[PDB]
């Protein structure tokens, strides 16, 4: 998948952020990440990862690129590290059902989730 540059504009929550993409603002929903008392923790985690980053990148998958609410559906990277995966591995989010063919990192995410589950981390306490 192609990683494209972006600039953080504003953190919203665990799996949602506003970014400057291709010369304009756009809300992005992190692909394959679902947020089920960890809502604030997830929000804080993502916020910190993207604000302290010296580089943000977005990578669209092979399926539909935006949901019905107009948000871009992608894998977000902070300093080369995928936020989507970090959240799941930290047990702050579960892996969501694949949406419109966007499943490139599903397996990689299910593994991270399994490990988080094995570790009884946060949501898996």
Backbone conformation region of residue 121, classed left if phi is above 0, alpha if psi is from -120 to 50, else beta: beta
CB 56 within 8 A of CB 6: yes
- Per-residue b or e along 16-25, where b marks 16 or more CB atoms closer than 10 Å to that residue's CB: bbebebeeee
**Which residues, in sequence order, are bridge partners of residue 72?**
28, 66
User: Beta strand 72-78 with 25-30: parallel, antiparallel or unpaired?
Assistant: parallel
- End-to-end, the C-alpha distance of the chain in Å comes to 34
Which technique? X-ray
CA atoms within 13 A on the CB side of 119: 14
**CA-wise closest residue to 82 among 115, 63, 64, 104:** 104
The domain 1-125: what is its CATH number?
Answer: 2.40.50.90
The full set of domain ranges for the chain reads 1-125
Alpha carbon distance 37, 56 (integer Å):
28
């Amino acid at each position: 998948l192609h990683k494209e540059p972006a600039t953080l504009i504003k953190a919203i929550d665990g799996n949602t952020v506003k970014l400057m993409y291709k010369g304009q603002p756009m809300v992005f929903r992190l692909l394959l990440v679902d947020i089920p008392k960890y809502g604030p923790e997830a929000a804080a985690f993502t916020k910190k990862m993207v604000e302290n980053a010296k580089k943000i990148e977005v990578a669209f998958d092979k399926g539909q690129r935006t949901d019905k609410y107009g948000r871009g559906l992608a894998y977000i990277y902070a300093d080369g590290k995928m936020v989507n995966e970090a959240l799941v591995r930290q047990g702050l989010a579960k892996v969501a059902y694949v949406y419109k063919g966007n499943n490139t990192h599903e397996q990689h995410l299910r593994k991270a989730e399994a490990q988080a589950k094995k570790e009884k981390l946060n949501i898996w306490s």
